């Protein structure tokens, strides 16, 4: 009960900032997650023994892939921590519990392949889940781990509160399907601009949490340039492996996934920042003004990709 997690001074200070990088010491990441749960939710939210067992089973069910790995899980959870900490009073007790867990679990058992590749491969998961294929799998893996003996971190919740938090987690994980982001943001834009956005409306809260999940999921584009640049290598390592596997199916992949077309990456990054990242953080900042640092960092990285094209690096 009186056992607090405490970080070294540099991490204690920098973990509060949106652009925090969790570092290369894998063995410190569970401690970093518990620290964030304790400050974001409370020391009483979870039984420490159960929470630690849950974290280590989640870690075990992330694969050794270049990008969609345990480090991504904890990085996305940290961005959610920074949003929740900068928006103290906007979220319920159940939301703050559910959302850090949703972020830690959101890519469980990822193989480094898109929904598109599973569909073209005719993977068993594409028959089980016709849309948001990997995201339905991630939620399924989350429920599986929660149901392991001694892993039910929600055991003190009532039957109805348990159903609510698992529904927050389900919607939050499904929302990380980038196919669904475009429509979600357009609706939030319309609601904000016509002034009809209402945070007491549950359908509206769901949409705002969805955009928060996109924002946290893409947060590699909101880090300092050296972090963003080096993370991009891991992202494209997966894309190019998917491209190789498309070529093995006798399908020319899109240029983004073709390692023969690396020269086209800088221009592809601009498209992504302009079509996905900047609009995401712009709408998030309109709804949650204290998340402005994410938009600023995103714009800084857009400027860096423009410099790569001009051959200034
Ligand atoms: O940087 C890039 C290149 C373009 N790209 C992308 C992804 C899907 C479809 C089209 C483009 N995504 C990113 C990116 C930045 C942060 N996260 N992600 C991301 C998101 C989902 C899967 C893998 C990576
Ligand atoms: Mg995902
Ligand atoms: Zn993700």
Query: At how many Å resolution was this determined?
Result: 1.9
Q: Which atom of ligand 1 is nearest to the CA of 220?
A: 16
Task: Show the CA angle centred on residue 204, arms to residues 199 and 210, nearest 5°.
Answer: 110
**For ligand 1, mutation pick of 66, 67, 114, 178 (most atoms within 8 Å of CB):** 178
Determine which residue's CA is closest to atom 24 belonging to ligand 1: 235
Query: Both tokens of residue 216?
Result: 């946290």
Contact 257, 240 (CB under 8 A): yes
Alpha helices (H) along the chain: 9-14, 29-40, 48-60, 70-85, 93-105, 115-121, 124-128, 133-146, 159-174, 178-193, 202-217, 225-248, 265-272, 278-287, 292-309
The active-site residue out of 68, 110, 137, 138 is 68
Is 110 a residue of the active site?
no
Determine which residue's CA is closest to atom 3 belonging to ligand 1: 269
Main-chain dihedrals φ then ψ at residue 92, nearest 5 degrees: -75, 170
Alpha helices (H) along 86-158: 93-105, 115-121, 124-128, 133-146
Instruction: Give the residue numbers of the binding site for a divalent metal cation.
Output: 72, 106-107, 217
Q: Is 311 left (phi over 0), alpha (psi -120 to 50) or beta?
A: left
Nearest in space to 236 (alpha carbons), one of 264, 215, 259, 220: 259
Distance, C-alpha 182 to centroid of its chain: 16
Cα 89 to ligand 1 centroid, rounded to whole Å: 31
Establish whether residue 272 lines the binding site of ligand 1, counting it when its CB lies within 6 angstroms of any ligand atom.
yes
Establish whether residue 219 lines the binding site of ligand 1, counting it when its CB lies within 6 angstroms of any ligand atom.
no
Method: X-ray
- Would you state the torsion angle of the CA atoms of residues 39, 42, 44, 46, taken in this order, to the nearest 10 degrees? -70
Between the alpha carbon of residue 157 and those of residues 23, 104, 166, the distances in Å are: 34, 20, 11
Determine which residue's CA is closest to atom 5 belonging to ligand 1: 272
Q: How far apart are the first and last CA of the chain?
A: 51
Establish whether residue 218 lines the binding site of ligand 1, counting it when its CB lies within 6 angstroms of any ligand atom.
yes
Establish whether residue 235 lines the binding site of ligand 1, counting it when its CB lies within 6 angstroms of any ligand atom.
yes
Q: Which domains does the chain have, with CATH numbers?
A: 28-310 (1.10.1300.10)
The DSSP code for 27 is G
Cα 230 to ligand 3 centroid, rounded to whole Å: 17
Rg (CA), the chain: 19
């Amino acid at each position: 009960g009186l056992m607090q997690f405490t970080l070294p001074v540099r991490l204690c200070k920098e973990i509060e900032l949106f652009h925090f990088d969790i570092g290369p010491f894998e063995n410190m990441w569970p401690g970093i997650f518990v620290y964030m749960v304790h400050r974001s939710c409370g020391t009483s939210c979870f039984e420490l023994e159960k929470l630690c067992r849950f974290i280590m089973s989640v870690k075990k069910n992330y694969r050794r892939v270049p990008y969609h790995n345990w480090k991504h899980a904890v990085t996305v959870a940290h961005c959610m921590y920074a949003i929740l900490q900068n928006n103290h009073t906007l979220f319920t007790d159940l939301e703050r519990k559910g959302l850090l867990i949703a972020c830690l679990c959101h890519d469980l058992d990822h193989r480094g392949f898109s929904n598109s590749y599973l569909q073209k491969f005719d993977h068993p998961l594409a028959a089980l889940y016709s849309t948001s294929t990997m995201e339905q799998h991630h939620f399924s893996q989350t429920v599986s781990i929660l149901q392991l003996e001694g892993h039910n971190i929600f055991s003190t919740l009532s039957s109805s509160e348990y159903e609510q938090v698992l529904e927050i987690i389900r919607k939050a994980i499904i929302a990380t399907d980038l196919a669904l982001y475009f429509g979600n943001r357009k609706q939030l834009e319309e609601m904000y601009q016509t002034g009809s956005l209402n945070l007491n409306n549950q359908s509206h809260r769901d949409r705002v949490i969805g955009l928060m999940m996109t924002a946290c999921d893409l947060c590699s584009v909101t880090k300092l340039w050296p972090v963003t640049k080096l993370t991009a290598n891991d992202i494209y390592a997966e894309f190019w492996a998917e491209g190789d596997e498309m070529k093995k199916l006798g399908i020319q992949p899109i240029p983004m996934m073709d390692r023969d077309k690396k020269d086209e990456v800088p221009q592809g990054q601009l498209g992504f920042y302009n079509a996905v990242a900047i609009p995401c953080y712009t709408t998030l900042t309109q709804i949650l003004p204290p998340t402005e640092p994410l938009l600023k960092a995103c714009r800084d990285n857009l400027s860096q990709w423009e410099k790569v094209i001009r051959g200034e690096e």
